A paper describes a structure:
Bacterial Disulfide bond forming (Dsb) proteins facilitate proper folding and disulfide bond formation of periplasmic and secreted proteins. The M. tuberculosis proteome contains another predicted membrane-tethered Dsb protein, Mt-DsbA, which is encoded by an essential gene. Interestingly, an exhaustive transposon mutagenesis study showed that the genes encoding Mt-VKOR and Mt-DsbA are essential for optimal Mtb growth, whereas Mt-DsbE and Mt-DsbF are not, implying that Mt-DsbA is an essential Mtb protein. However Mt-DsbA possesses disulfide bond isomerase activity as confirmed by its ability to catalyze the refolding of scrambled ribonuclease A (scRNaseA) whereas Mt-DsbE and Mt-DsbF do not. This study represents the structural and functional characterization of an essential Mtb Dsb protein, Mt-DsbA, and suggests that Mt-DsbA likely acts on a distinct protein substrate set as compared to Mt-DsbE and Mt-DsbF due to their functional differences.
In this study, we have determined the 1.9 Å-resolution structure of the soluble form of Mt-DsbA (residues 46–255). The structure of Mt-DsbA was solved to 1.9 Å resolution, with two molecules in the asymmetric unit, and the final model had an Rwork/Rfree (%) of 20.2/23.8. Within the asymmetric unit, residues 56–255 from monomer A and residues 49–255 from monomer B were built into the electron density map while the remaining N-terminal residues were presumed to be disordered as there was no observable density. Each Mt-DsbA monomer comprises two domains, a TRX domain (residues 56–82 and 129–255) and an inserted α-helical domain (residues 83–128), reminiscent of the overall fold of Ec-DsbA. The TRX domain contains the canonical CXXC motif and consists of a four-stranded mixed β-sheet (β1-4) decorated with four α-helices (α1 and α6-8). The α-helical domain inserted between β3 and α6 of the TRX domain comprises four α-helices (α2-5), and is stabilized by a structural disulfide bond between helices α2 and α5 (Cys140 and Cys192 with a Sγ - Sγ distance of 2.1 Å), despite 100 mM DTT in the crystallization condition. The CXXC active site cysteines, adopt a right-handed hook conformation at the N-terminal of helix α1 where the solvent exposed Cys89 and solvent buried Cys92 are reduced with a distance of 3.7 Å between the two Sγ atoms. The Mt-DsbA cis-Pro loop (Thr214-Pro215-Thr216), a conserved feature within the redox-active TRX family, interacts with the CXXC motif through Thr214, which hydrogen bonds to both Cys89 and Cys92. The electrostatic molecular surface representation of Mt-DsbA reveals a shallow hydrophobic pocket at the CXXC active site surrounded by negatively charged patches. To determine whether Mt-DsbA has isomerase activity, we tested Mt-DsbA catalyzed recovery of active RNaseA from oxidized, disulfide-scrambled RNaseA (scRNaseA).
Residue numbers in the entry:
A (entry chain A), B (entry chain A): 56 to 256
Write the structure that this text describes.
Amino acid sequence: GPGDAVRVTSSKLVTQPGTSNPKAVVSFYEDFLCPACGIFERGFGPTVSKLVDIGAVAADYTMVAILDSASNQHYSSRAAAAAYCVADESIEAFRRFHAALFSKDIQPAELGKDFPDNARLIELAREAGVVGKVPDCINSGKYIEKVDGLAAAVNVHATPTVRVNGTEYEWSTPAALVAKIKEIVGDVPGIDSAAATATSA
Amino acid sequence: GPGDAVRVTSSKLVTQPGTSNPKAVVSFYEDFLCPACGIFERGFGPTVSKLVDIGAVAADYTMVAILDSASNQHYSSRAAAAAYCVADESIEAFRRFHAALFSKDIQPAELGKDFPDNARLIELAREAGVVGKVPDCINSGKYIEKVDGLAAAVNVHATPTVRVNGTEYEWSTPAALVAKIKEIVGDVPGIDSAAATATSA
Ligand SMILES: [Cl-]
Ligand SMILES: [Cl-]
């Protein structure tokens, strides 16, 4: 994630003919402390993952830190920054690490007293499959200023915000997202499967 | 809503034999400013309404104000207090008013600049079907201290929190809630309908 957003794609990515541009880019703007983003990601994550796998979409994630403050031990910014650290090593590891932070067992309550510290974030990055420069990147706070400026850069102050090809998308169910994507990329292999299993989780 | 919770039931309420106690009480602990509660209510509301209509559950709502602050113009507490004002007049009006505040067109962004003032809340109460003592109840801040103390009283500091017969319920989809309720009250008229239409919204 170079680059304000971390882009997640598979080798099956369906592109616009005559280009290397994805036909459908779903943009997600999220805060790791936001309980609404937690609900969204736990509900939609598998379906988005499947849309990526079959090549139907590129999934771009911009981890903002709008909830960050001393009162939450800077969890919003440290987690977002950690995700960008992880993405530097491996896109696949970012995928697991991003899913991990929004999982019910890990995401901290917004107004609670306990939040993963930097050592815990590094440990979760390790579990996601990467070390490399992550521990230094996290401990040094390499991406703190970056993530703290992201909300202003993309004009997002409510999360999760989703766009489909740049246009605001009023999401509802994962099955409806599959339907929306199919209107753009068509009946590509795996999409009806993605729809049917989205209707059942 | 007497009473920490506003209880919503229909005349079809299935009760424990030898008692006037509902066989299934679903307890909801919510903050009107909480975006997660907005997502939950928009996704689950119709299904809960149907469970109430067919008599499968009593739905008890405790409107906490954990997000309240001057930075949001006290929207959390004023809205919760308004809902209790509305409930004093009519349970049906509370149902509509509660659904109205969580609707996508009305619920304010948590970190935004604009929030319904007391005049707007009174106007929404009117649209929900009631006047009576509501304008005075709201303008006087009759229930502000009450709602500001609710979170501590029920020990809830994360919303939405749901309990089924007093036991914490890790909610997922409205169809799963129907399944859970059916385990308690059985195959009462309308419940399979509620399940099937829950699987489709
Ligand atoms: Cl990779
Ligand atoms: Cl009534």
